[PDB]
Tab-separated table of C-alpha atoms in Angstrom:
chain	number	residue	atom	x	y	z
D	1	UNK	CA	-26.062	14.832	-8.782
D	2	UNK	CA	-23.882	12.134	-10.312
D	3	UNK	CA	-20.213	13.192	-10.726
D	4	UNK	CA	-18.328	11.165	-13.339
D	5	UNK	CA	-14.636	10.299	-13.408
D	6	UNK	CA	-12.876	12.219	-16.178
D	7	UNK	CA	-9.503	10.353	-16.079
D	8	UNK	CA	-9.120	6.571	-15.960
D	9	UNK	CA	-7.551	4.982	-12.872
D	10	UNK	CA	-4.604	3.702	-14.947
D	11	UNK	CA	-3.747	7.300	-15.839
D	12	UNK	CA	-3.587	8.157	-12.142
D	13	UNK	CA	-1.379	5.135	-11.500
D	14	UNK	CA	0.918	6.253	-14.309
D	15	UNK	CA	1.005	9.744	-12.802
D	16	UNK	CA	1.887	8.293	-9.399
D	17	UNK	CA	4.599	6.000	-10.765
D	18	UNK	CA	5.862	8.776	-12.999
D	19	UNK	CA	5.835	11.214	-10.093
D	20	UNK	CA	7.813	8.830	-7.891
D	21	UNK	CA	10.258	8.349	-10.761
D	22	UNK	CA	10.595	12.127	-11.082
D	23	UNK	CA	10.797	12.670	-7.310
D	24	UNK	CA	14.151	10.877	-7.277
D	25	UNK	CA	15.624	13.255	-9.828
D	26	UNK	CA	13.767	16.523	-10.240
D	27	UNK	CA	10.758	17.564	-8.172
D	28	UNK	CA	8.173	18.743	-10.675
D	29	UNK	CA	4.790	20.073	-9.646
D	30	UNK	CA	3.708	22.091	-6.633
D	31	UNK	CA	3.155	21.916	-2.899
D	32	UNK	CA	-0.524	21.297	-2.002
D	33	UNK	CA	-1.197	22.868	1.372
D	34	UNK	CA	-4.037	25.126	2.460
D	35	UNK	CA	-6.759	24.707	-0.142
D	36	UNK	CA	-9.291	21.824	0.033
D	37	UNK	CA	-9.679	20.255	-3.400
D	38	UNK	CA	-12.240	17.848	-4.842
D	39	UNK	CA	-9.486	15.365	-5.690
D	40	UNK	CA	-8.782	13.040	-2.750
D	41	UNK	CA	-7.654	10.342	-5.182
D	42	UNK	CA	-4.213	11.790	-5.893
D	43	UNK	CA	-3.795	12.558	-2.198
D	44	UNK	CA	-4.883	9.032	-1.271
D	45	UNK	CA	-2.472	7.496	-3.778
D	46	UNK	CA	0.344	9.619	-2.373
D	47	UNK	CA	-0.543	8.653	1.191
D	48	UNK	CA	-0.882	4.980	0.212
D	49	UNK	CA	2.869	4.919	-0.341
D	50	UNK	CA	3.914	7.634	2.108
D	51	UNK	CA	1.696	7.432	5.215
D	52	UNK	CA	2.777	4.111	6.748
D	53	UNK	CA	6.305	4.651	5.423
D	54	UNK	CA	6.733	7.963	7.245
D	55	UNK	CA	5.645	6.294	10.491
D	56	UNK	CA	7.625	3.133	9.799
D	57	UNK	CA	11.251	3.782	8.824
D	58	UNK	CA	12.046	2.452	5.385
D	59	UNK	CA	9.374	-0.122	4.566
D	60	UNK	CA	10.601	-0.072	0.953
D	61	UNK	CA	13.652	-1.950	2.235
D	62	UNK	CA	12.809	-3.100	5.784
D	63	UNK	CA	9.671	-5.032	4.839
D	64	UNK	CA	11.657	-6.739	2.096
D	65	UNK	CA	14.487	-7.448	4.541
D	66	UNK	CA	12.552	-8.734	7.554
D	67	UNK	CA	10.776	-11.126	5.188
D	68	UNK	CA	13.944	-12.032	3.278
D	69	UNK	CA	14.763	-14.791	5.764
D	70	UNK	CA	12.512	-17.362	4.123
D	71	UNK	CA	13.442	-18.386	0.533
D	72	UNK	CA	11.187	-16.304	-1.691
D	73	UNK	CA	10.938	-15.827	-5.454
D	74	UNK	CA	10.625	-13.111	-8.117
D	75	UNK	CA	7.857	-10.516	-8.636
D	76	UNK	CA	5.390	-13.413	-8.864
D	77	UNK	CA	5.997	-13.896	-5.136
D	78	UNK	CA	6.194	-10.249	-4.054
D	79	UNK	CA	2.663	-9.159	-4.968
D	80	UNK	CA	1.522	-12.689	-4.140
D	81	UNK	CA	2.590	-12.309	-0.506
D	82	UNK	CA	0.170	-9.403	-0.179
D	83	UNK	CA	-2.719	-11.386	-1.688
D	84	UNK	CA	-1.766	-14.317	0.545
D	85	UNK	CA	-2.935	-12.447	3.637
D	86	UNK	CA	-5.712	-10.753	1.657
D	87	UNK	CA	-7.337	-14.181	1.443
D	88	UNK	CA	-7.671	-14.174	5.218
D	89	UNK	CA	-7.770	-10.547	6.263
D	90	UNK	CA	-8.655	-7.754	3.782
D	91	UNK	CA	-7.600	-5.094	6.283
D	92	UNK	CA	-6.730	-1.528	5.248
D	93	UNK	CA	-3.049	-2.375	5.568
D	94	UNK	CA	-3.501	-5.220	3.088
D	95	UNK	CA	-4.985	-2.910	0.474
D	96	UNK	CA	-2.139	-0.467	1.036
D	97	UNK	CA	0.493	-3.223	0.955
D	98	UNK	CA	-0.940	-4.657	-2.264
D	99	UNK	CA	-0.844	-1.240	-3.917
D	100	UNK	CA	2.579	-0.179	-2.613
D	101	UNK	CA	4.110	-3.564	-3.505
D	102	UNK	CA	2.954	-3.339	-7.093
D	103	UNK	CA	3.689	0.371	-7.430
D	104	UNK	CA	7.215	0.008	-6.028
D	105	UNK	CA	8.054	-2.987	-8.216
D	106	UNK	CA	6.473	-1.383	-11.278
D	107	UNK	CA	8.317	1.909	-10.736
D	108	UNK	CA	11.535	-0.066	-10.407
D	109	UNK	CA	10.811	-2.197	-13.472
D	110	UNK	CA	10.015	0.946	-15.477
D	111	UNK	CA	13.488	2.295	-14.708
D	112	UNK	CA	14.942	-1.125	-15.501
D	113	UNK	CA	13.256	-0.899	-18.922
D	114	UNK	CA	11.028	-3.845	-18.074
D	115	UNK	CA	7.645	-2.583	-19.275
D	116	UNK	CA	6.981	-6.190	-20.273
D	117	UNK	CA	6.843	-7.188	-16.606
D	118	UNK	CA	4.984	-4.017	-15.604
D	119	UNK	CA	2.212	-4.821	-18.060
D	120	UNK	CA	1.957	-8.319	-16.611
D	121	UNK	CA	1.819	-7.044	-13.029
D	122	UNK	CA	-0.830	-4.447	-13.854
D	123	UNK	CA	-2.799	-7.027	-15.830
D	124	UNK	CA	-2.774	-9.396	-12.860
D	125	UNK	CA	-3.665	-6.599	-10.433
D	126	UNK	CA	-6.686	-5.496	-12.460
D	127	UNK	CA	-7.773	-9.107	-12.934
D	128	UNK	CA	-7.458	-9.901	-9.226
D	129	UNK	CA	-9.300	-6.714	-8.237
D	130	UNK	CA	-12.174	-7.631	-10.557
D	131	UNK	CA	-12.195	-11.314	-9.612
D	132	UNK	CA	-11.354	-12.112	-5.988
D	133	UNK	CA	-11.421	-8.581	-4.579
D	134	UNK	CA	-14.434	-7.606	-6.697
D	135	UNK	CA	-16.929	-7.967	-3.843
D	136	UNK	CA	-14.519	-6.271	-1.447
D	137	UNK	CA	-14.036	-3.260	-3.721
D	138	UNK	CA	-17.808	-3.148	-4.190
D	139	UNK	CA	-18.272	-3.075	-0.411
D	140	UNK	CA	-15.622	-0.401	0.121
D	141	UNK	CA	-17.082	1.560	-2.781
D	142	UNK	CA	-13.744	1.595	-4.523
D	143	UNK	CA	-11.665	3.964	-2.430
D	144	UNK	CA	-14.656	5.469	-0.632
D	145	UNK	CA	-13.971	4.103	2.861
D	146	UNK	CA	-10.240	4.348	2.117
D	147	UNK	CA	-10.534	8.145	2.216
D	148	UNK	CA	-11.600	7.855	5.857
D	149	UNK	CA	-8.957	5.224	6.591
D	150	UNK	CA	-5.974	7.486	5.885
D	151	UNK	CA	-7.637	10.462	7.553
D	152	UNK	CA	-5.569	10.144	10.704
D	153	UNK	CA	-2.500	8.166	11.730
D	154	UNK	CA	-2.039	8.378	15.484
D	155	UNK	CA	-5.721	7.840	16.208
D	156	UNK	CA	-6.075	4.144	17.034
D	157	UNK	CA	-7.345	2.274	20.083
D	158	UNK	CA	-7.110	-1.309	18.855
D	159	UNK	CA	-3.541	-2.330	19.649
D	160	UNK	CA	-1.700	1.005	19.663
D	161	UNK	CA	1.139	1.243	22.185
D	162	UNK	CA	-0.064	2.240	25.631
D	163	UNK	CA	2.356	4.921	26.802
D	164	UNK	CA	2.520	8.109	28.843
D	165	UNK	CA	-1.015	8.834	30.038
D	166	UNK	CA	-2.172	5.244	29.570
D	167	UNK	CA	0.637	2.979	30.722
D	168	UNK	CA	3.453	4.867	32.402
D	169	UNK	CA	4.842	1.912	34.317
D	170	UNK	CA	5.702	-1.501	32.897
H	1	UNK	CA	2.451	-20.318	-0.078
H	2	UNK	CA	3.649	-18.529	3.059
H	3	UNK	CA	0.768	-17.190	5.148
H	4	UNK	CA	3.086	-16.918	8.159
H	5	UNK	CA	5.326	-14.573	6.184
H	6	UNK	CA	2.341	-12.668	4.809
H	7	UNK	CA	1.001	-12.319	8.338
H	8	UNK	CA	4.338	-10.875	9.447
H	9	UNK	CA	4.267	-7.974	6.987
H	10	UNK	CA	0.534	-7.666	7.611
H	11	UNK	CA	0.635	-7.324	11.404
H	12	UNK	CA	3.859	-5.299	11.365
H	13	UNK	CA	2.503	-2.952	8.714
H	14	UNK	CA	-0.905	-2.590	10.353
H	15	UNK	CA	0.587	-1.762	13.744
H	16	UNK	CA	3.374	0.499	12.466
H	17	UNK	CA	1.074	2.487	10.174
H	18	UNK	CA	-1.538	3.179	12.854
H	19	UNK	CA	1.345	4.252	15.133
H	20	UNK	CA	3.039	1.164	16.559
């Protein structure tokens, strides 16, 4: 039993970017609820730029604000700040940050009629993923382990805030 | 370039996502 991927990953990315672009104008599609499907990819992509955000506040602006204190640069510095920490900590949040950073900037550039930049960003992303993050992706089996990473959100006993039952007094 | 800055978004994102 060897299931093959019908659509290319770039098509999914385009669907995600396109969806986000449509979501801010006219919601087109449906509401996936009760009905387990064999497509965790689209769900994972959605969660990649919706999970942490819904438990954050407005990462799309906050993350760019809290890190806007130090003199940065253009897009060449945005996606580069994600890879910066990737070099010394390929944690799940780094993979998510790398994807959301590119997706957000690309979606914005698409609306700004800057496909030229989008193509460059995507080109660099693919190159990086098949060069420096090649072994990492090979270890994670692509998005294999990622599917189990976004399974929950409140379940964490590493550094999660100790409140209520745990630490009531402080 | 700026690992300190990268670490900021990293740690903040990691903690916030998994319920800060």
